[PDB]
Amino acid sequence: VGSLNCIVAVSQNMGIGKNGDLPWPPLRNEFRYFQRMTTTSSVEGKQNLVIMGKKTWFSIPEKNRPLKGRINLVLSRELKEPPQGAHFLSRSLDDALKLTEQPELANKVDMVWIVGGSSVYKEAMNHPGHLKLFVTRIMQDFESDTFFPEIDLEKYKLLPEYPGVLSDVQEEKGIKYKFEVYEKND
Ligand SMILES: NC(=O)c1ccc[n+]([C@@H]2O[C@H](COP(=O)([O-])OP(=O)(O)OC[C@H]3O[C@@H](n4cnc5c(N)ncnc54)[C@H](OP(=O)(O)O)[C@@H]3O)[C@@H](O)[C@H]2O)c1
Ligand SMILES: CCc1nc(N)nc(N)c1OCCCOc1ccccc1C[C@H](C)C(=O)O
Ligand SMILES: [Cl-]
């Protein structure tokens, strides 16, 4: 099993969601970036694992669930079985990561990507060990009801460049944004 990563897109006021949708209008290349980063595996014959909370699962359109080309895992203590379309369900991130040590996942999974929401990012960012945060800074305020926790800059380093990730300002639909990559190893 490869590296542990978070990936998020976040507005200037730290928002990540609104009424079960993104706070901003659709940004095609931000979506393409999310898809390519979470799908691309360094290892032949393996797929990456995407871990998400229950609300994030149901925020994906039914036609696009489960996320194609990736193994999907949902977090919930209320659900008794993985939701329709999913095959894995854990009560916590700690349980999900321990599940990657069992043969049904250990042989199949390369990278692990946490894709939201708020409480999943919170558990991951405090998880000990090597972690990277792939953070898209949307350079505007948007009305939000779900937020990204502030990054502890005493634990994380901001990388000036990361391989395959453009470091310049992006713009779509009048909205500027930037791809950032943070890293820690405690
Ligand atoms: N901009 C982005 O990058 C991004 C990414 C993802 C989602 N979103 C948007 O954010 C919103 C959804 O995110 P959200 O924060 O509201 O909810 P969420 O984390 O996806 O789902 C919350 C539910 O999932 C379970 N859960 C979450 N964290 C858990 C943990 N560490 N351990 C065990 N269970 C956990 C709990 O379910 P139970 O109550 O059943 O236990 C919780 O009620 C939507 O608006 C979505 O469009 C944005
Ligand atoms: C692109 C947004 C994003 N970007 C970054 N960088 N990291 C994230 N974790 C993140 O969330 C992705 C959650 C998965 O959403 C999918 C996935 C496939 C199809 C449709 C949706 C729902 C769309 C986004 C909506 O809600 O409109
Ligand atoms: Cl921050």
Side-chain angles (χ1 to χ4, degrees), residues 5 9 22 36 41 53-54 60 81 83-84 86-88 96 98 103 107-108 114 132 134 140 143 147 170 173 186:
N5 312 272
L22 303 177
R36 181 151 295 263
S41 165
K54 183 179 65 181
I60 304 167
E81 71 180 70
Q84 202 44 247
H87 300 267
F88 293 103
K98 288 170 178 170
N107 301 316
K108 303 180 180 65
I114 279 67
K132 297 189 215 80
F134 289 79
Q140 292 184 16
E143 192 177 332
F147 300 83
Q170 313 291 306
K173 311 301 166 181
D186 62 345

PDB file of all heavy atoms in Angstrom, residues 5 9 22 36 41 53-54 60 81 83-84 86-88 96 98 103 107-108 114 132 134 140 143 147 170 173 186:
ATOM      1  N   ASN A   5      -2.823  10.437   1.258  1.00  0.00           N
ATOM      2  CA  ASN A   5      -2.984  11.785   0.741  1.00  0.00           C
ATOM      3  C   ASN A   5      -4.395  12.278   1.006  1.00  0.00           C
ATOM      4  O   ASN A   5      -5.344  11.496   0.989  1.00  0.00           O
ATOM      5  CB  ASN A   5      -2.733  11.817  -0.760  1.00  0.00           C
ATOM      6  CG  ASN A   5      -1.471  11.103  -1.133  1.00  0.00           C
ATOM      7  OD1 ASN A   5      -0.411  11.704  -1.144  1.00  0.00           O
ATOM      8  ND2 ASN A   5      -1.565   9.789  -1.387  1.00  0.00           N
ATOM      9  N   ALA A   9     -10.646  20.984  -2.618  1.00  0.00           N
ATOM     10  CA  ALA A   9     -10.714  22.322  -3.188  1.00  0.00           C
ATOM     11  C   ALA A   9     -11.460  23.202  -2.196  1.00  0.00           C
ATOM     12  O   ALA A   9     -12.508  22.801  -1.674  1.00  0.00           O
ATOM     13  CB  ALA A   9     -11.415  22.311  -4.550  1.00  0.00           C
ATOM     14  N   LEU A  22     -20.899  21.748  -4.555  1.00  0.00           N
ATOM     15  CA  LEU A  22     -19.762  22.638  -4.389  1.00  0.00           C
ATOM     16  C   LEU A  22     -20.263  24.066  -4.208  1.00  0.00           C
ATOM     17  O   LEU A  22     -21.351  24.413  -4.680  1.00  0.00           O
ATOM     18  CB  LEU A  22     -18.832  22.577  -5.595  1.00  0.00           C
ATOM     19  CG  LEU A  22     -18.291  21.190  -5.941  1.00  0.00           C
ATOM     20  CD1 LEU A  22     -17.453  21.296  -7.207  1.00  0.00           C
ATOM     21  CD2 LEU A  22     -17.462  20.641  -4.790  1.00  0.00           C
ATOM     22  N   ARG A  36      -7.784  12.959 -12.271  1.00  0.00           N
ATOM     23  CA  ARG A  36      -6.494  12.399 -12.664  1.00  0.00           C
ATOM     24  C   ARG A  36      -5.616  12.105 -11.453  1.00  0.00           C
ATOM     25  O   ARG A  36      -4.957  11.057 -11.409  1.00  0.00           O
ATOM     26  CB  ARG A  36      -5.776  13.332 -13.642  1.00  0.00           C
ATOM     27  CG  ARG A  36      -4.424  12.796 -14.131  1.00  0.00           C
ATOM     28  CD  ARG A  36      -4.081  13.299 -15.546  1.00  0.00           C
ATOM     29  NE  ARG A  36      -5.025  12.794 -16.537  1.00  0.00           N
ATOM     30  CZ  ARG A  36      -4.812  11.733 -17.306  1.00  0.00           C
ATOM     31  NH1 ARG A  36      -3.666  11.068 -17.229  1.00  0.00           N
ATOM     32  NH2 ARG A  36      -5.741  11.339 -18.159  1.00  0.00           N
ATOM     33  N   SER A  41      -2.334   5.591 -10.872  1.00  0.00           N
ATOM     34  CA  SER A  41      -1.557   4.740  -9.981  1.00  0.00           C
ATOM     35  C   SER A  41      -0.179   4.510 -10.570  1.00  0.00           C
ATOM     36  O   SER A  41      -0.052   4.184 -11.753  1.00  0.00           O
ATOM     37  CB  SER A  41      -2.225   3.391  -9.737  1.00  0.00           C
ATOM     38  OG  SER A  41      -1.272   2.505  -9.156  1.00  0.00           O
ATOM     39  N   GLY A  53     -16.537  10.449   3.331  1.00  0.00           N
ATOM     40  CA  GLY A  53     -17.652  10.361   4.244  1.00  0.00           C
ATOM     41  C   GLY A  53     -18.955  10.116   3.503  1.00  0.00           C
ATOM     42  O   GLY A  53     -19.030  10.222   2.280  1.00  0.00           O
ATOM     43  N   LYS A  54     -19.993   9.806   4.282  1.00  0.00           N
ATOM     44  CA  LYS A  54     -21.293   9.453   3.716  1.00  0.00           C
ATOM     45  C   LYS A  54     -21.892  10.593   2.899  1.00  0.00           C
ATOM     46  O   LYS A  54     -22.454  10.366   1.821  1.00  0.00           O
ATOM     47  CB  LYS A  54     -22.240   9.046   4.849  1.00  0.00           C
ATOM     48  CG  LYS A  54     -23.616   8.592   4.406  1.00  0.00           C
ATOM     49  CD  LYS A  54     -24.460   8.198   5.631  1.00  0.00           C
ATOM     50  CE  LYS A  54     -24.747   9.404   6.532  1.00  0.00           C
ATOM     51  NZ  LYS A  54     -25.546   9.016   7.741  1.00  0.00           N
ATOM     52  N   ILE A  60     -22.023  12.894  -4.927  1.00  0.00           N
ATOM     53  CA  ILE A  60     -21.615  12.514  -6.286  1.00  0.00           C
ATOM     54  C   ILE A  60     -22.846  12.054  -7.062  1.00  0.00           C
ATOM     55  O   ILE A  60     -23.631  11.257  -6.534  1.00  0.00           O
ATOM     56  CB  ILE A  60     -20.564  11.409  -6.226  1.00  0.00           C
ATOM     57  CG1 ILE A  60     -19.377  11.845  -5.365  1.00  0.00           C
ATOM     58  CG2 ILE A  60     -20.122  11.003  -7.637  1.00  0.00           C
ATOM     59  CD1 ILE A  60     -18.428  10.699  -4.998  1.00  0.00           C
ATOM     60  N   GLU A  81     -24.344  -1.446   5.845  1.00  0.00           N
ATOM     61  CA  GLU A  81     -23.662  -2.053   4.714  1.00  0.00           C
ATOM     62  C   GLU A  81     -23.282  -0.946   3.751  1.00  0.00           C
ATOM     63  O   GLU A  81     -23.874   0.141   3.787  1.00  0.00           O
ATOM     64  CB  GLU A  81     -24.540  -3.107   4.022  1.00  0.00           C
ATOM     65  CG  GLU A  81     -25.718  -2.560   3.240  1.00  0.00           C
ATOM     66  CD  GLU A  81     -26.536  -3.669   2.596  1.00  0.00           C
ATOM     67  OE1 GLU A  81     -27.202  -4.420   3.337  1.00  0.00           O
ATOM     68  OE2 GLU A  81     -26.497  -3.803   1.355  1.00  0.00           O
ATOM     69  N   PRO A  83     -23.231   1.568   0.814  1.00  0.00           N
ATOM     70  CA  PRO A  83     -24.387   2.003   0.021  1.00  0.00           C
ATOM     71  C   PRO A  83     -24.349   1.374  -1.365  1.00  0.00           C
ATOM     72  O   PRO A  83     -23.316   0.883  -1.824  1.00  0.00           O
ATOM     73  CB  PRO A  83     -24.223   3.526  -0.042  1.00  0.00           C
ATOM     74  CG  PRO A  83     -22.787   3.760   0.194  1.00  0.00           C
ATOM     75  CD  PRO A  83     -22.334   2.683   1.155  1.00  0.00           C
ATOM     76  N   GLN A  84     -25.502   1.379  -2.031  1.00  0.00           N
ATOM     77  CA  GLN A  84     -25.581   0.740  -3.339  1.00  0.00           C
ATOM     78  C   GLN A  84     -24.577   1.379  -4.289  1.00  0.00           C
ATOM     79  O   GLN A  84     -24.503   2.607  -4.409  1.00  0.00           O
ATOM     80  CB  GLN A  84     -26.995   0.833  -3.914  1.00  0.00           C
ATOM     81  CG  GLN A  84     -27.269  -0.233  -4.985  1.00  0.00           C
ATOM     82  CD  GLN A  84     -26.746  -1.618  -4.590  1.00  0.00           C
ATOM     83  OE1 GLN A  84     -25.812  -2.141  -5.204  1.00  0.00           O
ATOM     84  NE2 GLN A  84     -27.345  -2.210  -3.561  1.00  0.00           N
ATOM     85  N   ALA A  86     -21.294   0.828  -3.801  1.00  0.00           N
ATOM     86  CA  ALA A  86     -20.046   0.714  -3.070  1.00  0.00           C
ATOM     87  C   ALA A  86     -19.882  -0.700  -2.532  1.00  0.00           C
ATOM     88  O   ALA A  86     -20.846  -1.456  -2.387  1.00  0.00           O
ATOM     89  CB  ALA A  86     -19.981   1.717  -1.910  1.00  0.00           C
ATOM     90  N   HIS A  87     -18.634  -1.053  -2.235  1.00  0.00           N
ATOM     91  CA  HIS A  87     -18.332  -2.379  -1.722  1.00  0.00           C
ATOM     92  C   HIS A  87     -17.582  -2.363  -0.400  1.00  0.00           C
ATOM     93  O   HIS A  87     -17.400  -3.434   0.191  1.00  0.00           O
ATOM     94  CB  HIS A  87     -17.523  -3.181  -2.752  1.00  0.00           C
ATOM     95  CG  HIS A  87     -18.239  -3.368  -4.054  1.00  0.00           C
ATOM     96  ND1 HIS A  87     -19.015  -4.471  -4.330  1.00  0.00           N
ATOM     97  CD2 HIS A  87     -18.324  -2.568  -5.146  1.00  0.00           C
ATOM     98  CE1 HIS A  87     -19.533  -4.355  -5.541  1.00  0.00           C
ATOM     99  NE2 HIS A  87     -19.128  -3.207  -6.057  1.00  0.00           N
ATOM    100  N   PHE A  88     -17.169  -1.193   0.086  1.00  0.00           N
ATOM    101  CA  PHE A  88     -16.435  -1.070   1.339  1.00  0.00           C
ATOM    102  C   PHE A  88     -17.018   0.051   2.183  1.00  0.00           C
ATOM    103  O   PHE A  88     -17.411   1.097   1.661  1.00  0.00           O
ATOM    104  CB  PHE A  88     -14.938  -0.807   1.102  1.00  0.00           C
ATOM    105  CG  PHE A  88     -14.232  -1.979   0.469  1.00  0.00           C
ATOM    106  CD1 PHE A  88     -13.910  -1.971  -0.883  1.00  0.00           C
ATOM    107  CD2 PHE A  88     -13.930  -3.102   1.221  1.00  0.00           C
ATOM    108  CE1 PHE A  88     -13.272  -3.059  -1.460  1.00  0.00           C
ATOM    109  CE2 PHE A  88     -13.297  -4.189   0.650  1.00  0.00           C
ATOM    110  CZ  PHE A  88     -12.977  -4.172  -0.695  1.00  0.00           C
ATOM    111  N   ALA A  96     -10.576   2.093   8.370  1.00  0.00           N
ATOM    112  CA  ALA A  96     -10.368   1.964   6.931  1.00  0.00           C
ATOM    113  C   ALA A  96      -8.907   1.688   6.608  1.00  0.00           C
ATOM    114  O   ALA A  96      -8.597   0.853   5.751  1.00  0.00           O
ATOM    115  CB  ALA A  96     -10.836   3.238   6.219  1.00  0.00           C
ATOM    116  N   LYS A  98      -6.641   0.326   8.583  1.00  0.00           N
ATOM    117  CA  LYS A  98      -6.309  -1.034   8.996  1.00  0.00           C
ATOM    118  C   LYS A  98      -6.870  -2.052   8.009  1.00  0.00           C
ATOM    119  O   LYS A  98      -6.280  -3.124   7.810  1.00  0.00           O
ATOM    120  CB  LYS A  98      -6.820  -1.294  10.416  1.00  0.00           C
ATOM    121  CG  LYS A  98      -6.000  -0.559  11.481  1.00  0.00           C
ATOM    122  CD  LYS A  98      -6.622  -0.611  12.877  1.00  0.00           C
ATOM    123  CE  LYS A  98      -5.720   0.107  13.894  1.00  0.00           C
ATOM    124  NZ  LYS A  98      -6.360   0.322  15.228  1.00  0.00           N
ATOM    125  N   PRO A 103      -6.070  -8.973   2.969  1.00  0.00           N
ATOM    126  CA  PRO A 103      -5.762  -9.371   1.584  1.00  0.00           C
ATOM    127  C   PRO A 103      -6.717  -8.818   0.545  1.00  0.00           C
ATOM    128  O   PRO A 103      -6.303  -8.617  -0.604  1.00  0.00           O
ATOM    129  CB  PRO A 103      -5.836 -10.898   1.641  1.00  0.00           C
ATOM    130  CG  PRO A 103      -5.539 -11.237   3.055  1.00  0.00           C
ATOM    131  CD  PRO A 103      -6.166 -10.138   3.862  1.00  0.00           C
ATOM    132  N   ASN A 107      -3.542  -6.350  -1.716  1.00  0.00           N
ATOM    133  CA  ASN A 107      -3.035  -6.786  -3.006  1.00  0.00           C
ATOM    134  C   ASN A 107      -3.455  -5.867  -4.144  1.00  0.00           C
ATOM    135  O   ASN A 107      -2.855  -5.925  -5.225  1.00  0.00           O
ATOM    136  CB  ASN A 107      -3.517  -8.212  -3.281  1.00  0.00           C
ATOM    137  CG  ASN A 107      -3.068  -9.192  -2.212  1.00  0.00           C
ATOM    138  OD1 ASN A 107      -1.914  -9.168  -1.781  1.00  0.00           O
ATOM    139  ND2 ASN A 107      -3.980 -10.055  -1.772  1.00  0.00           N
ATOM    140  N   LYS A 108      -4.446  -5.006  -3.913  1.00  0.00           N
ATOM    141  CA  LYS A 108      -5.097  -4.250  -4.972  1.00  0.00           C
ATOM    142  C   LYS A 108      -4.863  -2.751  -4.907  1.00  0.00           C
ATOM    143  O   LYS A 108      -5.030  -2.082  -5.928  1.00  0.00           O
ATOM    144  CB  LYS A 108      -6.613  -4.490  -4.941  1.00  0.00           C
ATOM    145  CG  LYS A 108      -7.011  -5.969  -5.058  1.00  0.00           C
ATOM    146  CD  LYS A 108      -8.524  -6.145  -5.011  1.00  0.00           C
ATOM    147  CE  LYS A 108      -8.920  -7.613  -5.125  1.00  0.00           C
ATOM    148  NZ  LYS A 108      -8.461  -8.417  -3.956  1.00  0.00           N
ATOM    149  N   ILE A 114      -7.918  10.613   0.571  1.00  0.00           N
ATOM    150  CA  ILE A 114      -9.085  11.065   1.326  1.00  0.00           C
ATOM    151  C   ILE A 114      -9.698  12.225   0.546  1.00  0.00           C
ATOM    152  O   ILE A 114      -9.013  13.218   0.266  1.00  0.00           O
ATOM    153  CB  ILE A 114      -8.705  11.502   2.753  1.00  0.00           C
ATOM    154  CG1 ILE A 114      -8.556  10.296   3.688  1.00  0.00           C
ATOM    155  CG2 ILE A 114      -9.777  12.398   3.355  1.00  0.00           C
ATOM    156  CD1 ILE A 114      -7.417   9.402   3.365  1.00  0.00           C
ATOM    157  N   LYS A 132       0.378  13.877   2.670  1.00  0.00           N
ATOM    158  CA  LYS A 132       0.390  15.029   1.772  1.00  0.00           C
ATOM    159  C   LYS A 132      -1.021  15.564   1.631  1.00  0.00           C
ATOM    160  O   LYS A 132      -1.990  14.793   1.605  1.00  0.00           O
ATOM    161  CB  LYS A 132       0.959  14.683   0.382  1.00  0.00           C
ATOM    162  CG  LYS A 132       2.417  14.240   0.395  1.00  0.00           C
ATOM    163  CD  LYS A 132       2.991  14.124  -1.013  1.00  0.00           C
ATOM    164  CE  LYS A 132       3.989  12.994  -1.128  1.00  0.00           C
ATOM    165  NZ  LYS A 132       3.286  11.690  -1.270  1.00  0.00           N
ATOM    166  N   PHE A 134      -3.222  17.841  -0.940  1.00  0.00           N
ATOM    167  CA  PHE A 134      -3.344  18.453  -2.265  1.00  0.00           C
ATOM    168  C   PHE A 134      -4.516  19.417  -2.166  1.00  0.00           C
ATOM    169  O   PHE A 134      -5.674  18.999  -2.124  1.00  0.00           O
ATOM    170  CB  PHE A 134      -3.543  17.381  -3.333  1.00  0.00           C
ATOM    171  CG  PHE A 134      -2.307  16.568  -3.595  1.00  0.00           C
ATOM    172  CD1 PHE A 134      -1.928  15.542  -2.732  1.00  0.00           C
ATOM    173  CD2 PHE A 134      -1.493  16.854  -4.689  1.00  0.00           C
ATOM    174  CE1 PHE A 134      -0.792  14.805  -2.961  1.00  0.00           C
ATOM    175  CE2 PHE A 134      -0.345  16.119  -4.924  1.00  0.00           C
ATOM    176  CZ  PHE A 134       0.012  15.085  -4.061  1.00  0.00           C
ATOM    177  N   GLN A 140     -11.517  33.088  -4.248  1.00  0.00           N
ATOM    178  CA  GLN A 140     -12.681  33.933  -4.003  1.00  0.00           C
ATOM    179  C   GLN A 140     -13.411  33.397  -2.782  1.00  0.00           C
ATOM    180  O   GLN A 140     -13.253  32.233  -2.411  1.00  0.00           O
ATOM    181  CB  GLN A 140     -13.665  33.959  -5.186  1.00  0.00           C
ATOM    182  CG  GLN A 140     -13.178  34.643  -6.444  1.00  0.00           C
ATOM    183  CD  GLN A 140     -14.249  34.695  -7.521  1.00  0.00           C
ATOM    184  OE1 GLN A 140     -15.435  34.485  -7.246  1.00  0.00           O
ATOM    185  NE2 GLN A 140     -13.836  34.981  -8.754  1.00  0.00           N
ATOM    186  N   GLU A 143     -20.300  31.403  -0.426  1.00  0.00           N
ATOM    187  CA  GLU A 143     -21.203  30.981   0.642  1.00  0.00           C
ATOM    188  C   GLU A 143     -21.142  29.467   0.806  1.00  0.00           C
ATOM    189  O   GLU A 143     -21.351  28.721  -0.157  1.00  0.00           O
ATOM    190  CB  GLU A 143     -22.629  31.432   0.328  1.00  0.00           C
ATOM    191  CG  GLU A 143     -23.594  31.297   1.489  1.00  0.00           C
ATOM    192  CD  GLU A 143     -24.977  31.826   1.156  1.00  0.00           C
ATOM    193  OE1 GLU A 143     -25.078  32.738   0.308  1.00  0.00           O
ATOM    194  OE2 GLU A 143     -25.965  31.326   1.738  1.00  0.00           O
ATOM    195  N   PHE A 147     -16.772  23.192   5.891  1.00  0.00           N
ATOM    196  CA  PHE A 147     -15.493  23.890   5.821  1.00  0.00           C
ATOM    197  C   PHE A 147     -14.308  22.945   5.981  1.00  0.00           C
ATOM    198  O   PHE A 147     -14.406  21.876   6.584  1.00  0.00           O
ATOM    199  CB  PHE A 147     -15.444  24.996   6.880  1.00  0.00           C
ATOM    200  CG  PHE A 147     -16.532  26.022   6.721  1.00  0.00           C
ATOM    201  CD1 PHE A 147     -17.801  25.800   7.239  1.00  0.00           C
ATOM    202  CD2 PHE A 147     -16.293  27.193   6.029  1.00  0.00           C
ATOM    203  CE1 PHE A 147     -18.806  26.734   7.072  1.00  0.00           C
ATOM    204  CE2 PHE A 147     -17.291  28.136   5.864  1.00  0.00           C
ATOM    205  CZ  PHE A 147     -18.552  27.904   6.386  1.00  0.00           C
ATOM    206  N   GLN A 170      -4.560  29.344 -12.231  1.00  0.00           N
ATOM    207  CA  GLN A 170      -5.544  28.821 -13.172  1.00  0.00           C
ATOM    208  C   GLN A 170      -6.757  29.742 -13.209  1.00  0.00           C
ATOM    209  O   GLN A 170      -7.065  30.408 -12.219  1.00  0.00           O
ATOM    210  CB  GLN A 170      -6.004  27.433 -12.733  1.00  0.00           C
ATOM    211  CG  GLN A 170      -4.857  26.501 -12.342  1.00  0.00           C
ATOM    212  CD  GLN A 170      -4.041  26.115 -13.558  1.00  0.00           C
ATOM    213  OE1 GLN A 170      -4.594  25.627 -14.544  1.00  0.00           O
ATOM    214  NE2 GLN A 170      -2.731  26.380 -13.517  1.00  0.00           N
ATOM    215  N   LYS A 173     -14.262  30.228 -15.871  1.00  0.00           N
ATOM    216  CA  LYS A 173     -15.547  30.821 -15.514  1.00  0.00           C
ATOM    217  C   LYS A 173     -15.367  32.044 -14.614  1.00  0.00           C
ATOM    218  O   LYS A 173     -16.166  32.295 -13.712  1.00  0.00           O
ATOM    219  CB  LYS A 173     -16.462  29.786 -14.853  1.00  0.00           C
ATOM    220  CG  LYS A 173     -16.564  28.469 -15.627  1.00  0.00           C
ATOM    221  CD  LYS A 173     -17.093  28.682 -17.055  1.00  0.00           C
ATOM    222  CE  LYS A 173     -16.873  27.454 -17.940  1.00  0.00           C
ATOM    223  NZ  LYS A 173     -17.366  27.653 -19.345  1.00  0.00           N
ATOM    224  N   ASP A 186       5.351  13.339  10.568  1.00  0.00           N
ATOM    225  CA  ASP A 186       5.513  13.151  12.009  1.00  0.00           C
ATOM    226  C   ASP A 186       5.025  11.761  12.430  1.00  0.00           C
ATOM    227  O   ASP A 186       4.125  11.599  13.257  1.00  0.00           O
ATOM    228  CB  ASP A 186       4.781  14.256  12.793  1.00  0.00           C
ATOM    229  CG  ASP A 186       3.277  14.257  12.558  1.00  0.00           C
ATOM    230  OD1 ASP A 186       2.822  13.610  11.596  1.00  0.00           O
ATOM    231  OD2 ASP A 186       2.552  14.908  13.340  1.00  0.00           O
TER     232      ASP A 186
END
